[PDB]
Amino acid sequence: PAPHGGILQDLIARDALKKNELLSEAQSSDILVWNLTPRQLCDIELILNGGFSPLTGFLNENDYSSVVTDSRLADGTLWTIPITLDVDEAFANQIKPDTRIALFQDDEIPIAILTVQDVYKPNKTIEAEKVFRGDPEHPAISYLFNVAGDYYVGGSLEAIQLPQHYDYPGLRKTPAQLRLEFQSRQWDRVVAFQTRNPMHRAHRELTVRAAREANAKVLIHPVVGLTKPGDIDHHTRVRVYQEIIKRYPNGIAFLSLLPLAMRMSGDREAVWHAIIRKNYGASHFIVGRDHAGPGKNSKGVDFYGPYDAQELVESYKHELDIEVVPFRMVTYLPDEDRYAPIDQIDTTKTRTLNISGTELRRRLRVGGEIPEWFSYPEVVKILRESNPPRPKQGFSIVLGNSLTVSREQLSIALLSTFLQFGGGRYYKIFEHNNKTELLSLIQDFIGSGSGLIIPNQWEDDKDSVVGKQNVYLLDTSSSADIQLESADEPISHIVQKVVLFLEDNGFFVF
Amino acid sequence: PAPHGGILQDLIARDALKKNELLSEAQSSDILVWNLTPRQLCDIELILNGGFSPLTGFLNENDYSSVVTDSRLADGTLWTIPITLDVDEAFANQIKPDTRIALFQDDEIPIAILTVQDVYKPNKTIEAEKVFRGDPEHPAISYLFNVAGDYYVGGSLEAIQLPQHYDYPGLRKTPAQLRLEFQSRQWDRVVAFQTRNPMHRAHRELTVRAAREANAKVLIHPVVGLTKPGDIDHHTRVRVYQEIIKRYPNGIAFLSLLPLAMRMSGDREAVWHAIIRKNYGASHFIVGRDHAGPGKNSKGVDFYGPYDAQELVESYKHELDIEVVPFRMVTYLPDEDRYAPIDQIDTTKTRTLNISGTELRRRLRVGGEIPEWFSYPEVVKILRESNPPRPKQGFSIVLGNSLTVSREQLSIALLSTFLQFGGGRYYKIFEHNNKTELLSLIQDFIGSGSGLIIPNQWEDDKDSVVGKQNVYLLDTSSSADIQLESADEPISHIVQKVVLFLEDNGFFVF
């Protein structure tokens, strides 16, 4: 269907003949520069390539306010997620309306020139409540307060070039490009599938049934910008998509990556996804259970109800101009060797099997088997590689502050001991000297599968620098992972405690 | 047989009742301390545990000189390798005869008290020529000049404790201990096998035949102190020995580790090995082809003739007091599915197969198959782990000084590109800032299998800090591993050059 607002605002194409001129202005000595944050790069790419039609810049306060309370742009155009350029006070003060500023990437690549319409300090409590529902634990609110700038700069954009990406150049289709790809194949009915996760047999099955019921071709449009915190990296995920797309019948599916920065804003985001896919050329879209929802908070309560998304999108059905296909999740029937829509089988009368994310995570952590009815083997092989089991995981042993035995000798004892065991893990007694440049290397070593022995703890005002994954404290204190019987426990006893701890946790296997 | 000189100089046992007294003296405030170098720890352990009977300390000049020219101690006792305590001038000056000094390990563990008999500056050109044959490339001469102190301190030793080791506590038998292990099994004929390498089927076969011909039990006595430069680490090797010892018929073999510091001094060392094994309780010993020889020098010439060792040991036969079993190397006969002594088959009349070290190294580098007739599978599995093939090897790409493209962008491009590929290798753009504390981490990352992208070169006065294995220079210069067409070559072209280079070299496999 036609782009939201009727026109594809592909600013790259619009400004093609001003590229040199704009590029030269961006590189002028007198122009004020702003370095785009990683989320802003995600947003500006979608504005510049028309992914966010009718947007043609970051929202000024007039539009922003309507989006916050009315879920629309001041002109009444449905638009549920505010896209603004958040800056700090120091920069906001240097700019006034009509000021033209340059937006760079990595402090070296000019992306666009923004003509300032306004500068304002939004009430983040209202946005937090109105747009994201108010739970301080909602990733969007966390970002809203802890990362986002306190001042929004609204203004019209002029394009120099889209944010630079060196990976998957072939798959990052812009709206215009994707539309031409469909057009060259004569596809005029396309159902799009959103995801920020690996795809298993069930996803393959459900998307194909969608294709069959909507009489449409399939578009697997995964998000590769910012997704939920803790999600699997997009490189791993792209590898999985590239693998699963080969499992569809020839000529029925197309894989294209979307550099979107999700807010995990549930029902509002679901609407936004529909609009965005319409701009990219899809005729149909599937909205899932708790679509774009971040789940439950600490108190175990739902950030959104499982059907809020589908209900909200349905309420805007008459103006979305993109058909929404009903979400029919499928489950595996052992006794019939097939998948079937969950709404068609009687739980208490028919056998069904499925592997929850929690269980999948466990199996991967212990190197256990994962059945082909759940996920294709080539897909599982990829997941095991990016997330190796414990015998292949790195780790660190931190000699606590309470230790009175010789740190130099205990570290040497641990090294010599670990080195006896096989498995190929690399070991290092690592001294950081409380230097940040060294502390930041700890998780890289662990990520590399290495075993580090750290002679002493770093200062508390440095915790933030070190990731806590697979990092274990050896100390007399109660908060120690490997508790010492006493501060002067004999080195050989300590060594045993560590070895058996690592064994119990799967790092060593004999 | 009886220890060389007639008495096992086990100083640990001799001084058992002075341990507290000696320990207290070593920890006195006024006593002069010397930190033992890694080779001296190897030597003192063998002196203290009687491994070097009749030695009871480091050689004074009187004995040392006789060993250098006469191959004997001043009393006429056969002794071919000088064992001295080499120190720098600053320390030598602080000591005079009768001075009692303490010998520590790791600057914290007291090993012994040495009563200085003399202090002298040896003519290292004579020792180099007389003891090690004079080739400046002989590892012993290299050490003699580049590492060893210029002053020898001769003196009698009193034991506090043997050098601390936390790995393989069970297998490091002292002479007295090994002798009791043989005695408890009623073994009175034992043939010992020396090695600083992995053991393959041929070694298993030849040692068993030795046992059969000498009517003796087998002692696999591998060196785990210092061996030849470039040798496989002893942890890997011990794993292999522990594995192969299980392939002998029950009750025929015993595995014990020897903390010797080899000099790779060919025929002289061969004699020394015989003496040492006699002290440890062996009745027989096998002297191999080019036994304890370092091979050929740069000009491709032999450091020693292949039979110098066997000939020298044979010339001392009447006073060694340990039988030397003839070395009968075996080779595999495909057509008969068996190994047979090489001196029994006609090369041109019978089929024989064998895998040279060079070829073994290749197969391991490319992950190729290695047949069970060559080495037991459990042994090969261990070698593959410590020395993984290229797809599992780490590496570094150094952005040369000639580069005029943006280093920050080229590094980012390489990262994003590498991250597309699968395989689980971990990647890092690593900035060392010419800091030693960071440069020394490069090979640890590579040893961990990681891929590092280094934005700029380090200063030449730092080369020594970084190992050169799997480190590749991207530069316009001729000495670059990955040569740029020009200093400003487009980033995408450079990326391709690197990817294809790494592929050609096996790091990436598609």
Add this chain to the structure above:
Amino acid sequence: SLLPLAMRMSGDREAVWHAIIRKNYGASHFIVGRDHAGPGKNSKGVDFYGPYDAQELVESYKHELDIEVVPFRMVTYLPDEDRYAPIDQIDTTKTRTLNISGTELRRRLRVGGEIPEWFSYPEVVKILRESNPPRPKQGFSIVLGNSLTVSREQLSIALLSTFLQFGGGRYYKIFEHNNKTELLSLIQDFIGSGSGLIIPNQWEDDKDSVVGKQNVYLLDTSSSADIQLESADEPISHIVQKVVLFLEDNGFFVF
């Protein structure tokens, strides 16, 4: 169909006889092979019959045998073509051919080695391996020679305890025959059963015939001993080693 014939291995005469016999059983044709029904060569390595005596003799009686004799066209395997072809059709020096002699087949079976499907069908090879197991599965006997002055009761006990350490499932027995025929005749049955027997003393020479000599080894100082002792009073532990390593060299034990 099985024929309860008692062959005489009488070469060409027997070949004729086989033709007659098959005619009686109803065959219209018969193949006479190379050295058909021949026993091979004698000690001096000379042929009991010429390779074509049989075919020639049968051919000379062709007009009265009343059964057609089909020419014998032996086939060989062509690796490069994955097929068998008549040996009389290929040029030895121009075309690759593979084949496994009886001697080699026997070896492979004795050592448990692989035998390729181009030579014999796997189900056929499985059967041959069962009736003729490789050395690790073969029985054997160790006879303590008459020259031994060490204690026979202790050496036998030492050997037993030692063998019992090793795995593999072979059953062991210190077997006393007391020169009784009823016991001596059981030796090869035990060996045929895969068992390992330790025999404390030799039987009288007028009894040799009763015991098969397969896998029976003499431990003695004499020159004709399979496992030669350094001396009659060699220490028991040394003797044990000599035996273990001998059995290993010969494939009975594998570690």
